[PDB]
């Protein structure tokens, strides 16, 4: 029952010549006053688009969403500008249509240049994409069952072949993800790479497999921890999470450290389970503490045996803990990393997370498969400009998290084998 | 197990003279400043009245409405709710267009003794959800220092916290997890939800039946998987069924809904159901139509007589509906989430309706019955049989998470 590896990709398609191809892309980009702040998400689709041209596809039709317009046309979330950026990246005129479905759309595709690129309007302008939405009044509305089916058929007849290149939405069972009922359904280069790497980490992984977890809350991350406990051999738990585990397990004094009241109730069974499932759990054994949540506050180092004084708070793992990472990380053959090890946005408490990155980068050179999912950790990698030193940095946010929680991804399952 | 050990409003001995903060669900339908459905508001009255009768000094209410995503949005103000509240309490109700800071604390302290105060939309502050959106439509993360402050400012509002918004408890938002008061209890709605799901999911009288239905299997997979570890019996209908039947039995299904994603998982589910000794009841016959329209032509077909090409399954047949009787009426706990056909098409609603009649009948026999989802809740509403079921859940979101085997931070954050 391994559904990540066995899926057909664009790379394995032979009969693409003269066919029209519908491609689901992630174009959820930042934008100020009509100009696109970051292009990476647009830029990432290029290999998929380019390959379809080279192989002689008749027409390339791009569908995507922007933000949460909740089933209504909203000016802020028009993806017209993405056709303007795409214009430069391809060196061609790119046809943009005010709709994603219907009569005028169907003809305007078949009329444009052979081998040309068409970008359709935001899919979520239609309630039927998510299956639910909001009306002009702010009230929740559900889409009709016949309308959703029709909308899926409307999308289905736009092309002959379907390419999903949007892993970041594969966790939703939306119309664009599961409703394109074409014979040939394949992952794009972006989706393929995402599937390959998560397949390696989660399905017959090369072991020891290590998960490195951090962040502020435990409660946000119960299902993540519980599920990973079934898969991994080793787990680091750091960041703000550590103080909750330390308070429950050791009755450590934590001063004004972040304490997760909700998550603390789960610490017991997480540990009873780590034992049952043969997982080694590593928690920090010392801490860098600050007298105020500020980069310029007075700081100090304390061991877990010493504990944290009153009104002081732990904001980073201490030197002993950072030293403990070495054997844990450098001796694994697969690493999944989702969560900072301290408040890294502040330079004086960035060291724990930075040295953790250095170690993950070092073991990748040794041969280990290393994955970063999650936004915060990705921000760290981007800041250090070390993206290409990691085996894979996941774009998917909600989806990667949901896959790590053990959920099957509808968008992935709806691909051909 | 974490549902059945929680402190509720019933067990608080010292409410008198205390400032009480209440998290409620006021996420209501509205038009032109006029509230369409007051149900969610009147549901908070037993909580409010108890607090009143017990001698609370102030009753501070906090809630959210829709998804303003950290921006102040006139479309989702809570001012109209205070207007409605006045008519239900027979009493003037203070409304503040903020929810944190000293200006707010002072107006609470200044207000009449034993009075009710409603604060503005929690979700105008990015710190409630931790994430939000700016005037450009770009996703923005909230600063961690500000989140901690916002939580402290809510904690400073009162001496005792009451959570009554079960439907939000699945999210680690500031109002669910960050009210760090010593006494944190269920309101009457939360209590009822916890009592019922606790009974069903922790210590059920058996046979425990799950009734599942919907168009897709793709989104119900964790629902089914988890519920397989819980129940003795499971009915699967309403569209899902056609995917199971085609994959398992090789049954011709014509132009009926087929989940291309779910199909990959159907084999796995039946393996696990068999291995865990969970009996599966799938439709044995079907009501078929030549178009997804109420006015179409219709006939009935069996397991073996497949659905002919260009025909469509829209409801379980008479033999399948008869099969429900033995399954439902001999159960002692029933969890129901999903209609058994396209239920708001009169022709082909029958299966979904008879299933309701059987659930109602078993409740009279002494079973505990829970309706969870949104569409199932609607069916129970249009038939006006809300009072005929043991418990109809508010959540949708929170009830789904609980049925999928996940924990609720809002519940976890309550006292024992």
Curated annotation (Swiss-Prot), chain B:
ADP binds at residues 214, 238, 343. CDP binds at residues 214, 219, 238, 338, 343. Mg(2+) binds at residues 215, 219, 375. This is Phosphoglycerate kinase. Keywords: ATP-binding, Glycolysis, Kinase, Magnesium, Metal-binding, Nucleotide-binding, Transferase. Belongs to the phosphoglycerate kinase family. Pathway: Carbohydrate degradation; glycolysis; pyruvate from D-glyceraldehyde 3-phosphate: step 2/5. Its cofactor is Mg(2+). It holds the Pfam family PGK. It comes from Plasmodium falciparum (isolate 3D7). It comes from the Eukaryota. (2R)-3-phosphoglycerate binds at residues 24-27, 39-40, 63-64, 66-67, 122-123, 170-171. One of its GO terms (cellular component) is cytosol. Monomer. ATP binds at residues 215-216, 220, 239, 313, 376. One of its GO terms (biological process) is gluconeogenesis. The gene is PGK. GO terms for molecular function: ADP binding; ATP binding; metal ion binding; phosphoglycerate kinase activity. It catalyses: (2R)-3-phosphoglycerate + ATP = (2R)-3-phospho-glyceroyl phosphate + ADP. Its EC number is 2.7.2.3. HAMAP family: Phosphoglyc_kinase (MF_00145).
């Amino acid at each position: 029952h391994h559904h990540l590896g066995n899926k057909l990709s664009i790379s394995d398609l032979k009969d693409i010549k003269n066919k029209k191809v519908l491609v689901r892309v992630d174009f959820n980009v930042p934008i100020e006053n009509g100009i696109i702040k970051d292009t990476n998400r647009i830029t990432a689709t290029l290999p998929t688009i380019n390959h379809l041209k080279k192989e002689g596809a008749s027409k390339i039709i791009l569908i995507s969403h922007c933000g949460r317009p909740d089933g209504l046309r909203n000016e802020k979330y028009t993806l017209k500008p993405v056709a303007e950026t795409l214009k430069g990246l391809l060196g061609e005129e790119v046809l943009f249509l005010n709709d994603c479905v219907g009569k005028e759309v169907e003809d305007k595709i078949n009329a444009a240049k052979e081998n040309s690129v068409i970008l359709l309007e935001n899919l979520r302008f239609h309630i039927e994409e998510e299956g639910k939405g909001v009306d002009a009044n702010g009230n929740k509305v559900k889409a009709n069952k016949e309308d959703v089916e029709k909308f899926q058929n409307d999308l289905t007849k736009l092309a002959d072949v379907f390419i999903n290149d949007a892993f970041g939405t594969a966790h939703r069972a939306h119309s664009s993800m599961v409703g394109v009922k074409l014979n040939v359904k394949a992952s794009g280069f972006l989706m393929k790479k995402e599937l390959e790497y998560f397949s390696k980490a989660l399905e017959n992984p090369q072991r020891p497999l290590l998960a490195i977890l951090g962040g502020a809350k435990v409660s946000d991350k119960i299902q993540l921890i519980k599920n990973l406990l079934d898969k991994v051999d080793r787990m680091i738990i750091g960041g703000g999470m550590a103080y909750t585990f330390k308070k429950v397990l050791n009755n450590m004094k934590i001063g004004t450290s972040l304490f997760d009241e909700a998550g603390s109730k789960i610490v017991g069974e997480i540990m009873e389970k780590a034992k049952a499932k043969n997982v080694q759990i590593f928690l920090p054994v010392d801490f860098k503490i600050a007298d105020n949540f500020d980069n310029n506050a007075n700081t100090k180092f304390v061991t877990d045996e010493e504990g944290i004084p009153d009104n002081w708070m732990g904001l980073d793992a201490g030197p002993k803990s950072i030293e403990n990472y070495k054997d844990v990380i450098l001796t694994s053959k697969t690493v999944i990393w989702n969560g900072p090890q301290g408040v890294f946005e502040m330079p004086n408490f960035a060291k724990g997370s930075i040295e953790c990155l250095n170690l993950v980068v070092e073991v990748t050179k040794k041969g280990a498969i290393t994955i970063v999912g999650g936004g915060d950790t990705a921000s760290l990698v981007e800041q250090q400009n070390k993206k290409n030193e990691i085996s894979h940095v996941s774009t998917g946010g909600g989806a990667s998290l949901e896959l790590l929680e053990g959920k099957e991804l509808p968008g992935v399952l709806a691909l051909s084998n």
